[PDB]
């Protein structure tokens, strides 16, 4: 049966300052891509990510302490989100999960290549059902879905428990090329299924009361290549000077993080990017 992941989205002061008025549309744009990934048939389940609440923190002290140490930020965030959840799921703004988004670059013990953070198997535990996402651009939509994967009991696809069943899927242990034709591995598929068959989706059974509408356009529609570049490299960056790799300014100096342009991104009159390819908007 149908599962509804009622979610609170939280943005820290770094996000408020960076994004200004456009902040809530941007989080919703992230979450809508993540919501799509969870509807892909390879998850082999019926999962609906819905937003019941959004908090923006304009003053550090009114939110959790966000530090570059990712494990500690997650823990800070988890503690802090408790107080803002209504007790019973009868309440409309009661959430099953909470996600923090920050511009601060998050770090492990060893490098600052951390992109997000969550514990495994926590989705209906109100005090552990959280994630922190570093916002380095639109690709943070896939970070959002990966970490939500942890929350749903998915291990990384190199875990020994995944040997029997399966680097190119959502739950890769490191950033690599996603297979957009099959986002979730057989392992991810099984580990979420097991979890729900074991009864751990219980708080996901109730439908949301007037959820915050997610954008139904493509992320490239709201955000053109210059915007995309700015989300990654700061407001002074523009598109370089197509689709497969987004290059951005920094002797013309240009830089990339190797991601394609967001789907729906204008690549000329009557054409737009779809899975790394520039194609006519009108399809046959
Ligand atoms: C962008 C993007 N575009 O497409 C995709 C796909 C992405 C996301 C790629 C993911 C790579 C791996 N991570 S990561 O590199 O930040 C490492 C780490 C913080 C390790 C921690 C220890 C850890 N936490 C929990 C565990 F269950 C295991 N281990 N992680 O896995 C966090 O979940 C996060 C992001
Ligand atoms: Mg509150
Ligand atoms: Mg795609
Ligand atoms: Na980081
Ligand atoms: Na970094
Ligand atoms: Ni503001
Ligand atoms: Ni909007
Ligand atoms: Ni601080
Ligand atoms: Ni595969
Ligand atoms: Ni619920
Ligand atoms: Ni400015
Ligand atoms: Ni400027
Ligand atoms: Ni351009
Ligand atoms: Ni590089
Ligand atoms: Zn992970």
């Amino acid at each position: 049966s149908h599962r509804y992941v009622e979610t609170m989205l939280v943005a820290d002061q770094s996000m408020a300052e960076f994004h200004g008025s456009g902040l809530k549309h941007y989080l919703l744009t992230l979450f809508s891509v993540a919501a799509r990934l969870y509807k892909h048939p390879s998850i082999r389940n019926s999962v609906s990510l819905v937003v019941v609440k959004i908090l923006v923190i304009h003053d550090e002290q009114k939110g959790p302490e966000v530090t570059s140490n990712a494990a500690l930020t997650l823990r800070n965030f988890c503690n802090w989100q408790k107080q803002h959840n209504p007790p019973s799921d009868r309440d409309a703004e009661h959430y099953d999960t909470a996600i923090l988004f920050t511009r601060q670059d998050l770090c492990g013990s060893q490098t600052c290549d951390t992109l997000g953070m969550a514990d495994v198997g926590t989705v209906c535990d109100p005090s552990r059902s959280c994630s922190v996402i570093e916002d380095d651009g639109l690709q943070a939509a896939f970070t959002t879905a990966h970490e939500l994967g942890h929350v749903f009991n998915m291990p990384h696809d190199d875990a020994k428990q995944c040997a029997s069943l399966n680097d190119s899927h959502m739950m890769a242990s490191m950033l690599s090329n996603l297979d957009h034709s099959q986002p979730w591995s057989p392992c991810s598929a099984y580990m979420i299924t097991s979890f729900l068959d074991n009864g751990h989706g219980e708080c996901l059974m109730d439908k949301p009361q007037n959820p915050i509408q997610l954008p139904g356009d493509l992320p490239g529609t709201s955000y053109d290549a210059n915007r995309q570049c700015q989300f990654t490299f700061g407001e002074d960056s523009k598109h370089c000077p197509t689709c497969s790799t987004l290059w951005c300014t920094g002797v013309l100096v240009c830089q990339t993080k190797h991601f394609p342009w967001a789907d729906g991104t204008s690549c000329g009159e009557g054409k737009w990017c779809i899975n790394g390819k520039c194609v006519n908007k009108l399809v046959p």
Side-chain angles (χ1 to χ4, degrees), residues 1-89 91-284:
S1 75
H2 277 89
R3 310 298 212 264
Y4 298 95
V5 182
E6 294 177 285
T7 310
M8 174 170 71
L9 300 180
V10 185
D12 78 359
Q13 184 172 118
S14 72
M15 295 288 284
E17 295 205 61
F18 189 81
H19 290 283
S21 91
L23 171 63
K24 300 187 218 220
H25 185 71
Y26 180 80
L27 299 167
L28 287 185
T29 305
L30 296 183
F31 200 67
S32 85
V33 175
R36 312 214 162 95
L37 287 166
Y38 274 86
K39 298 215 134 283
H40 192 270
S42 56
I43 213 179
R44 293 289 139 87
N45 284 280
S46 200
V47 183
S48 217
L49 307 188
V50 299
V51 186
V52 299
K53 190 181 183 161
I54 303 202
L55 281 173
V56 173
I57 297 155
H58 292 103
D59 207 324
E60 160 249 359
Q61 33 137 220
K62 312 239 192 86
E65 164 66 9
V66 178
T67 36
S68 176
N69 183 341
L72 190 52
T73 304
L74 180 51
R75 178 178 76 160
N76 285 343
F77 176 51
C78 291
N79 300 334
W80 176 89
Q81 55 90 23
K82 300 226 275 174
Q83 98 213 188
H84 297 265
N85 203 5
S88 149
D89 210 344
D91 179 286
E93 273 165 313
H94 173 96
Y95 47 96
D96 303 326
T97 219
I99 314 185
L100 185 69
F101 291 95
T102 178
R103 297 292 291 183
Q104 320 247 310
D105 200 86
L106 302 169
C107 314
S109 148
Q110 72 302 287
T111 39
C112 293
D113 285 346
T114 309
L115 301 180
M117 213 51 275
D119 310 303
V120 187
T122 54
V123 72
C124 292
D125 177 355
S127 65
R128 294 184 62 189
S129 193
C130 313
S131 29
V132 306
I133 304 291
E134 192 188 321
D135 175 29
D136 47 4
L138 282 194
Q139 67 265 27
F142 290 76
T143 307
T144 302
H146 178 98
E147 307 311 329
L148 278 170
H150 286 317
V151 174
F152 265 105
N153 215 48
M154 296 178 196
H156 287 154
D157 285 323
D158 54 7
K160 288 345 219 66
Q161 59 257 43
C162 300
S164 166
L165 290 163
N166 284 339
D167 287 310
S168 48
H169 294 292
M170 278 306 309
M171 302 303 309
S173 54
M174 263 167 140
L175 177 63
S176 29
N177 300 320
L178 185 68
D179 175 349
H180 292 81
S181 86
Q182 213 83 153
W184 308 103
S185 57
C187 194
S188 297
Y190 177 87
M191 296 294 281
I192 186 152
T193 300
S194 292
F195 196 49
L196 304 188
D197 280 358
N198 293 172
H200 298 286
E202 260 200 323
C203 71
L204 305 185
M205 303 306 282
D206 74 312
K207 276 216 276 200
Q209 297 88 97
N210 256 295
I212 304 187
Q213 295 150 24
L214 303 165
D217 288 353
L218 278 184
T221 303
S222 300
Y223 299 121
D224 61 33
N226 295 291
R227 300 292 285 120
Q228 298 186 40
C229 278
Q230 284 187 293
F231 299 138
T232 308
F233 301 104
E235 64 174 52
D236 283 317
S237 181
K238 60 152 204 210
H239 186 229
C240 184
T242 76
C243 300
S244 63
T245 294
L246 169 61
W247 286 88
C248 300
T249 59
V251 174
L252 177 47
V253 171
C254 282
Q255 51 186 352
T256 180
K257 278 173 174 68
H258 284 287
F259 293 96
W261 305 19
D263 286 342
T265 307
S266 175
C267 52
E269 181 93 313
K271 307 181 80 87
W272 68 5
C273 297
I274 295 292
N275 292 0
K277 316 209 210 308
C278 187
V279 298
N280 294 304
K281 271 156 176 140
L282 303 165
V283 304

